[PDB]
């Protein structure tokens, strides 16, 4: 299998360098290029520049020319890109695409002799502020929760900085009719989130609903089991 | 730089209906070999993009026989013969012609569904925020489709103003509709010192406001 997977998120403070990782699976980083591309949130991609695996030049756009340097690890399978003397314009998704070779894999819709497969993304915020891990409560089930014989369960993912703040179910075999949504900004300045999954009610006695939330800059990991109760 | 821009700005469709974007090119796309490299690339709200078209017509594997393209010169434009829920998002026009390789702004492809009434639930503070000394109150507006939504948090028949913040999803992948989700945020003082907590929602869907409510019951 084709599998790209990207350092978690990271904050960084104005002036310093970050650092973000590229680990491909199921093919050596040989004779596959690799491409670096920033997307500023709700706004344009920016292809920073290439790097090729075998020796080859690699480019970098004029913008990053002087901050940016790529590297690999050949051994890992991992390529590295590290933008200095960050500034706040600085805070936005970073991408790797394995633009190269052949994937061979399938990876649900095969890529084949396509070259392209994207990173996940890593989220970089340029900031002096103070890390603050979330706080997660439950939004349990109720009376007030049921329409229809379907009942709504979640998690509220209160007062954390910065933004990327990862929401799974039932350590990710819970997907359907699960929404999270957008974060919101408290006047504080720290941001808070909520996670809702409707089920249904019969299963509320059967069924175990746990949230996974991961604040990778606070390094929380945190599993609050939802359960019903009370109105 | 090349410059990359996309024509349509955002798009309202209907399901099963066709779809074009295009992309405008400041210089020519060909090459110093001979050919064209252009690529098209959708990217599904929250998503890394996916590569769909490379060169004007050129497919990438195991991407649908509906998307197609076409291009001359400098103008190029993406076409989806019939479009699903599935396909919502936003299209970027890529160029690996010239360095450095250039993107188009963008363009956000939504869906026009017929109207969806939200389900309106209310989930009450729970202790252990009460303990760290505050109590948020939250209502949740699932499955709606049009995006227009009014939420209204009412304390004791008591209309409140600020102390609440919302957030509206991306349009659903499989839906096409929305959902929308309201917190109201109180000390636990504050909390404590009334009996009725309710949010009334009011949407087009909705044949008269629906209020959804509970008794603090200390809790």
């Known amino acids: 299998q084709v599998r790209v997977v990207q350092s978690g998120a990271e904050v960084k403070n104005p002036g310093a360098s970050v650092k973000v990782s590229c680990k491909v699976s199921?093919?050596?980083?040989?004779?596959?290029?690799i491409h670096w591309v920033r997307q500023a949130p709700g706004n344009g991609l920016e292809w920073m520049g290439g790097?090729?695996?075998?020796?080859?030049?690699?480019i970098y756009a004029q913008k990053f020319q002087g901050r940016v340097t790529m590297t690999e690890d050949t051994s890992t399978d991992t390529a590295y890109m590290e933008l200095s003397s960050l500034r706040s314009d600085d805070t936005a998704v970073y991408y790797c695409?394995?633009?190269?070779?052949?994937?061979?894999?399938?990876?649900?819709?095969?890529?084949?002799?396509?070259?392209?497969?994207w990173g996940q993304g890593t989220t970089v915020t340029v900031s002096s502020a103070s890390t603050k891990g979330p706080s997660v409560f439950p939004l349990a089930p109720s009376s007030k929760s049921t329409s229809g014989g379907t009942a709504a369960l979640g998690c509220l993912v209160k007062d954390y900085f910065p933004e990327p703040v990862t929401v799974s179910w039932n350590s990710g075999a819970l997907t359907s009719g699960v929404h999270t949504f957008p974060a919101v900004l408290q006047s504080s300045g720290l941001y808070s989130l909520s996670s809702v999954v409707t089920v249904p009610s019969s299963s509320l006695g059967t069924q175990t609903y746990i949230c996974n939330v991961n604040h990778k800059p606070s390094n929380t990991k945190v599993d609050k089991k939802v359960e019903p109760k009370s109105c | 730089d090349i410059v990359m821009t996309q024509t349509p700005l955002s798009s309202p469709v209907t399901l099963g209906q066709p779809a074009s974007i295009s992309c405008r090119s400041s210089?020519?796309?060909?090459?110093?070999?001979?050919?064209?490299?252009l690529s098209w690339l959708q990217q599904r709200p929250g998503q890394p993009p996916r590569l769909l078209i490379y060169?004007?017509?050129n497919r990438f594997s195991g991407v649908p026989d509906r998307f197609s393209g076409s291009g001359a010169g400098t103008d190029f434009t993406l076409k989806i013969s019939r479009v699903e829920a599935e396909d919502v998002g936003v299209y970027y026009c890529?160029?690996?012609?010239?360095?450095?390789?250039?993107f188009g702004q963008g363009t956000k492809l939504e869906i026009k569904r017929t109207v969806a009434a939200p389900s309106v639930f209310i989930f009450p503070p729970s202790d252990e925020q009460l303990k760290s000394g505050t109590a948020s109150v939250v209502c949740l507006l699932n499955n709606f489709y049009p995006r227009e939504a009014k939420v209204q948090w009412k304390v004791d028949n008591a209309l409140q103003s600020g102390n609440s913040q919302e957030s509206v999803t991306e349009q659903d992948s499989k839906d096409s509709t929305y959902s929308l989700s309201s917190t109201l945020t109180l000390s636990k003082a504050d909390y404590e010192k009334h009996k009725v907590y309710a949010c009334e929602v009011t949407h087009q869907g909705l044949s008269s406001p629906v209020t959804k409510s509970f008794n603090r019951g200390e809790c």
């Open positions: 695409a394995t633009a190269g070779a052949i994937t061979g894999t399938p990876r649900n819709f095969y890529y084949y002799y396509g070259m392209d497969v």
């Open positions: 199921g093919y050596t980083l040989t004779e596959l290029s």
């Open positions: 790097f090729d695996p075998e020796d080859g030049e690699t």
């Open positions: 210089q020519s796309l060909v090459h110093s070999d001979g050919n064209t490299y």
């Open positions: 060169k004007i017509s």
């Open positions: 890529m160029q690996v012609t010239q360095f450095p390789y250039t």
